[PDB]
Structure formats: structure tokens, C-alpha cells
Amino acid sequence: LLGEVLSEGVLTLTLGRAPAHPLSRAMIAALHDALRRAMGDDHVHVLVIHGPGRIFCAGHDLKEIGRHRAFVTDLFEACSALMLDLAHCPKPTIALVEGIATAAGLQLMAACDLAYASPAARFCLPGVQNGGFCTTPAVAVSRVIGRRAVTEMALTGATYDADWALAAGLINRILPEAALATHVADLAGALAARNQAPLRRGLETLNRHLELPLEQAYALATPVMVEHFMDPGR
């Protein structure tokens, strides 16, 4: 269950299944279908992922399949395929967080390019308390915060506030909850209003070079910089 609304190039993905907004197998498929269509639609310029209320996203719902593995293997491989596609998405992805982002719910947020929270927003990786470990969510989280920060979240399973998240680089800015909706809408709207071709090529190049050494990064980046200056929309 997903709500989709397009307004001036901005596509807002409003996560259903209130209040926990769980990443069930059907939710992951719905989120991936919405993304495959968005990346192929010229009308969609920017993506906004909103999990409304008290909980941004609780992660996968602890549902029961017990016959024979095959379900959990399908679940995680599809979840990883979504998170990969979302982080490597050429078009800007923004997460609007008003509450708690836990487990795979923190991953969804961490996989977005930008993340804006209200002061009441809490962040967690609770695996150790449930007799597990958040291996897959720590992949996307480890890319946005320092090695000490992710190690403490994963090992202790504690809930962290918005202030710690701002200082760690988990979110971009903390805004009062009445201003959060407008801030994201204006920021996304302005992003949608710029010359698109250099934006997508620029974001794609940025993601690719962060996994390359300095020398190869400049080899990739330089011709991409020439192309921006040769663009008719400059």
C-alpha cells in the first residue's frame, strides 16, 4: 500500500499501512514499482519518501511463514535490490521523518540522498535486543555516519535523538514540525525547477566516484564537467 501524488516534478511517496508503515514483501514491491516507473518518467524530477506520524517506518513486519528460509531469502534479496536502486537513483531522493526510524526503516531513510527530521525523531537499530543484528540496515547507515557511530548503534541497539543524528550526519537539518512539510516541498520543488540533465548526470557521477580512488574519480568526473558547460540549459 502506497500513495502517489505528482506536483511540479515532485513525486511524493506516502507510505501506507499506518502506524508502523512496515516494509512487508508487498510494500517493498510497491516501493520498487514506484521507483522503476519514476526513473523512467520524464515528468518525475525528484522523489520524496514520507512515512507519516509517530513512526517513520518500523522496518520489516515480523510476519509468519513456517513450512520447510525461502521467504526470508526472497524478502531480504528484494529489500536489498530496492535499497541499491534507491541509493544509485540518478534523480534526488528525500526522506521526510517525523518519528521513529527503526531497522530497515532507518535503512530506507539512509538510502535517500537527503533526510530532514523534526525534533521528536528517534533513530534505532534494535537487532541485538531481538536476538539478531541489523546487518542489511547497517550497510546503508554505514555510508552516512562515522565508523564509531554505526558500531555503537548496531551493538547497543539504543534509540538516538534528532540532535545526535544531525551531529552524526544521519539527517541534513532539524526543523520545527510545523515547518518540516514546507521545507522539504520547497527544497524538492527548487531541485525540480533546475536544468535536469546536468543534475542527474552530476548526482550519478558523485555516487560513482565516492567508491573510486582520487585519480580515477577525476578521470570520470572531468568529462562530465565539460558536458555541464556544453549543456544548452546552462
Residues 82-141 that bind a second copy (CB under 8 A): 83-84, 87-88, 92, 113-115, 127-136, 138-139
Helix (H, G, I), strand (E, B) or coil at 95: strand
> What's the order of all strands across the beta sheet hosting 100-102?
55-57, 100-102, 123-124
Is 182 a residue that touches a second copy (CB under 8 A)?
A: no
Give yes or no for residue 68 binding a second copy (CB under 8 A). Answer: no
- For residue 54, the 8-state DSSP code is S
Residue closer to a second copy (CB basis): 53 or 174: 174
Closest CA to 115 of 211, 47, 40, 68: 47
- Residue 207 amino acid letter: N
Q: Does residue 39 belong to the site contacting a second copy (CB under 8 A)?
A: no
Amino acid at 158: A
In the complex, minimum distance from the CB of residue 134 to a second copy, in angstroms, rounded to a whole number: 7
Among 12, 102, 118, 205, contact with a second copy (rule: CB under 8 A): 205
Quote the least distance from Cβ 208 to a second copy, whole Å.
8
- Nearer Cβ to a second copy (53/208): 208
Residue 51 vs 127, nearer CB to a second copy: 127
Secondary structure class of 105 (helix, strand, coil): helix
Indicate whether 178 belongs to the interface with a second copy (CB under 8 A).
no
**Any contact of residue 144 with a second copy (CB under 8 A)?**
yes
Q: Give the total residue count for the chain.
A: 234
Burial bucket for residue 102 (CB in 10 Å: 0-12, 13-18, 19+): buried
CB nearer to a second copy: pick between 43 and 148: 148
Determine which residue in the list 40, 42, 64, 68 makes contact with a second copy, applying CB under 8 A.
Answer: 64
Q: Which three cell numbers stand for residue 233?
A: 540549459
- Number of amino acids touching a second copy (CB under 8 A): 80
Q: Is residue 61 classed exposed, middle or buried when 0-12, 13-18 and 19+ CB atoms within 10 A define those classes? A: middle
